[PDB]
């Protein structure tokens, strides 16, 4: 196989979506998906979304390098807070370009692997995998804990959008909090989508 583990490693590579200027991405490899060992989840500097890329097969990933520097585990500052945070419904507040408020209703999912001071989170108006250092925003008041409150991992998945065509994907993870909620990787995109499957 890979015969060396880049989980927890710093990576950098070019992004070749065309014959123009080629951006250079730096990032931290968060996980290698058990049900698809070619798929890696990566926290890229400057991206609020976790990215899923088959880092060694994708042609968009040019001149891929793995840095010798691993990222250590920065141990939990406020463990119980962090641990009571996981799974709650939250109000996340961001400043916009103007500087006016922008409040987003979401759910904290889990503690991010590798980058241990960060939390997986997704939002109602954008059900993809975000990643934020949520302790700061909570003590700053930008985050509000709201009081409102058979693993099919490894199976293929199909959606029907407006045109009525299959969107093929795979189930890659289950949230231990809220096991009815899952991570999905579609073939056509690098975003990790978050769905509540066992909903009825």
């Amino acid at each position: 196989g890979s015969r060396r583990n880049i989980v927890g490693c710093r990576i950098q590579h070019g992004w070749k979506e065309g014959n123009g200027p080629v951006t250079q991405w730096k990032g931290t490899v968060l996980d290698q998906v058990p049900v698809n060992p070619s798929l890696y989840l990566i926290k890229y500097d400057g991206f609020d979304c976790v990215y899923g890329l088959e880092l060694n097969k994708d042609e968009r990933v040019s001149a891929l390098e793995v840095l010798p520097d691993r990222v250590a585990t920065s141990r939990i500052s406020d463990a119980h807070l962090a641990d009571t945070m996981i799974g709650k419904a939250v109000e996340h507040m961001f400043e916009t370009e103007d500087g006016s408020k922008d409040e987003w209703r979401g759910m904290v999912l889990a503690r991010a692997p590798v980058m241990n001071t960060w939390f997986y989170i997704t939002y109602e108006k954008d059900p993809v995998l975000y990643m934020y250092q949520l302790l700061d925003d909570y003590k700053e008041g930008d985050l509000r804990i709201m009081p409102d409150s058979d693993s099919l991992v490894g199976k293929q998945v199909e959606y029907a959008k407006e045109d009525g065509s299959k969107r093929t994907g795979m189930v890659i993870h289950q949230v231990e909090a809220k096991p009815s909620v899952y991570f999905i990787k579609f073939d056509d995109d690098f975003h990790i989508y978050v769905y509540d499957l066992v909903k009825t």
Partner: peptide
């Protein structure tokens, strides 16, 4: 806006 719908 944001990241991917």
């Amino acid at each position: 806006v944001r990241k991917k719908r």
